[PDB]
C-alpha cells in the first residue's frame, strides 16, 4: 500500500506516534517519506552485509526483524520481517517505536539525519487535521 500524505499522518496519529519519545508526527512523516515514499512494500537489499530494509520505515533485518536469511542477525522487535510488509502498519509502528526506545532515538535512521534533522518538516502534516 502506498499511502497518501494526510492519510498516513492520521494513521500514524491514531497509532500513538504523535510525540512518542518526544518525536513529532512531522518527523515520522519525513522519515517515512524519505525511507519509502510512503510505500509499505518497499524493500532494499544491502549486498554489503546481506541484510534487507523492510516496509514504510525501511527497518533493517540485521537487528529488528527476522527473515531467516541475515547472518548472525537479531530480531529486537520480535517480528517476522513479513509483518513489516503489510498494508496495515500497526506492527511496523510498534517496531519503529521499539527502534527509537534505544539511545539514538529518531537518529537511528541515517535518512532522518540527512533529510529531516534541522529541516523545516511542517509541510509534512499541514492540512492533515493532526
Swiss-Prot record:
EC number, UniProt record: 3.2.1.17
Gene Ontology biological process: antimicrobial humoral response; defense response to bacterium; defense response to Gram-negative bacterium; defense response to Gram-positive bacterium; inflammatory response; killing of cells of another organism
GO cellular component: azurophil granule lumen; extracellular exosome; extracellular region; extracellular space; specific granule lumen; tertiary granule lumen
Subcellular location: Secreted
EC class: hydrolase
Disulfide bridge map: 6-128, 30-116, 65-81, 77-95
SUPFAM superfamilies: Lysozyme-like
Annotated ranges, domain C-type lysozyme: 1-130
Location of the active site: 35, 53
Disease implication from the record: Amyloidosis, hereditary systemic 5: A form of hereditary systemic amyloidosis, a disorder characterized by amyloid deposition in multiple tissues resulting in a wide clinical spectrum. AMYLD5 primarily affects the viscera, and the predominant clinical features are renal dysfunction of varying severity, and intra-abdominal bleeding. Inheritance is autosomal dominant.
Family under the similarity heading: Belongs to the glycosyl hydrolase 22 family.
Summary of subunit composition and partner proteins: Monomer.
Protein name: Lysozyme C
Organism listed in the record: Homo sapiens (Human)
Lineage, top ranks: Eukaryota, Metazoa, Chordata, Craniata, Vertebrata
Amino acid at each position: 500500500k502506498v499511502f497518501e500524505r494526510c492519510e498516513l499522518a492520521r494513521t500514524l496519529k491514531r497509532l500513538g506516534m504523535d510525540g512518542y519519545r518526544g518525536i513529532s508526527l512531522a518527523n515520522w512523516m519525513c522519515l517515512a517519506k524519505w525511507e519509502s515514499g510512503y510505500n509499505t512494500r518497499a524493500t532494499n537489499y544491502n549486498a554489503g552485509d546481506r541484510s534487507t530494509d523492510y516496509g514504510i520505515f525501511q527497518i533493517n533485518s540485521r537487528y529488528w526483524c527476522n527473515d531467516g536469511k541475515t547472518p548472525g542477525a537479531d530480531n529486537a522487535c520480535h517480528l517476522s520481517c513479513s509483518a513489516l510488509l503489510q498494508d496495515n502498519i500497526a506492527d511496523a509502528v510498534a517496531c519503529a517505536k521499539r527502534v527509537v526506545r534505544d539511545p539514538q532515538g529518531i537518529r537511528a535512521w541515517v535518512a532522518w539525519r540527512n533529510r529531516c534533522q534541522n529541516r523545516d518538516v511542517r509541510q509534512y502534516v499541514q492540512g492533515c487535521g493532526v
